[PDB]
Amino acid sequence: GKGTPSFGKRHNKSHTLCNRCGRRSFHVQKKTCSSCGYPAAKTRSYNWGAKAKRRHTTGTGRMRYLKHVSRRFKNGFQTGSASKA
Amino acid sequence: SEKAGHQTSAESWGTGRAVARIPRVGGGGTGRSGQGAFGNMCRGGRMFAPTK
């Protein structure tokens, strides 16, 4: 009664795909994502979650802009163009 | 490393017949779950007297 015949009634989703993190944790009745803090401005993270931050900190993505910052510093944030000596 | 071996959320099961008392990795589906942890004899556990 509380087992395999009551598992047949499970066909109503509670969570759906989130826009900020794409994680399928955006709870529908609360309108808030339980993994990435959406729609609040601060991304949810805690210091008891140690593996929880290693899945979502920087460097795990593509880093479309940070991967060129350490290169542009080393030349000195120079402008202009090359010389053809 | 000072945290090597403790990156695990195991828990003891209890006193049944066909199992020991070493805390077992909870969860399911992965094949790591239901294995021993935190022991010096456990595969994937810390060593005795972690060197400093």
């Binding site: - | 099961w13 209890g14 006193t15 049944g16 017949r17 066909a18 199992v19 077992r24 909870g26 399911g28 589906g29 992965t30 094949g31 779950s33 239901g34 294995q35």
Partner: protein
């Protein structure tokens, strides 16, 4: 192609020995499940029929 079609049959053999029904059957079994081994079931309400 006869070089390439034989290598798809060399590299299939390990899944066939474990009776994997494809390259999409990756059913990983638990070593020991909780509800078979962790319990003391005495006089009273018991954990199954």
């Amino acid at each position: 192609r006869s070089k390439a079609d034989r290598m798809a049959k060399m590299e299939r053999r390990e899944r066939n020995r474990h009776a994997k029904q494809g390259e999409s059957d990756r059913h990983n079994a638990v070593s020991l499940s909780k509800h078979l081994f962790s319990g003391k079931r005495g006089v009273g309400k018991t954990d199954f029929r």
